[PDB]
Design a protein around this ligand. Structure first.
Ligand SMILES: O=C(O)c1cccc(N2C(=O)C(O)=C(C(=O)c3ccc(Cl)s3)[C@@H]2c2cc(Cl)c3c(c2)OCO3)c1
Length: 123
């Protein structure tokens, strides 16, 4: 069966740039997908969206809206040392964390920094 790493690579193969907010959204989709044994339906939705003519970016957002593990779900917390550990291409997408961030509203993840700071990654 397809693994989280396989699916990450497949999705990466469709994205422009490196270390962008969409690359992180791929990471989150694969990790949450792995943890809920849903990598197959996620891959199926991804390919179906591309097949309909959607951009790969739109296909990733549609996964957050169509695959039920993401619906009304909070973004995962990812512990990191400092803001510098986040890829350069994501930096301008980092925001203060709103009261009830939701993945299907574009809040990809929340970075929990060592010194207590928290930053949400927004699309
Ligand atoms: O361990 C796994 O099975 C697995 C599956 C998919 C993705 C990942 N993740 C990584 O290996 C990894 O480095 C991940 C990552 O996105 C980042 C780490 C540091 C910065 Cl900055 S971003 C990623 C991962 C994604 C999510 Cl949603 C996580 C996570 C790691 O830990 C808790 O929530 C792990």
């Amino acid at each position: 069966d397809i693994s989280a790493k396989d699916l990450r690579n497949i999705m990466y193969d469709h994205l422009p740039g490196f270390g962008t907010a969409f690359h992180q959204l791929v990471q989150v989709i694969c990790k949450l997908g792995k943890d809920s044994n849903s990598l197959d339906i996620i891959h199926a939705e991804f390919q179906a969206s591309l097949a309909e003519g959607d951009s790969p970016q739109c296909a990733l957002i549609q996964i957050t809206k169509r695959v039920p593990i993401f619906q009304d779900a909070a973004p995962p917390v990812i512990h990191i040392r400092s803001r510098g550990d986040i890829p350069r291409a994501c930096q301008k997408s980092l925001r203060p964390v709103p009261p009830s961030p939701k993945i299907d509203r574009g809040w990809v993840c929340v970075f929990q920094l060592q010194d207590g700071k928290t930053l949400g990654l927004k699309i």
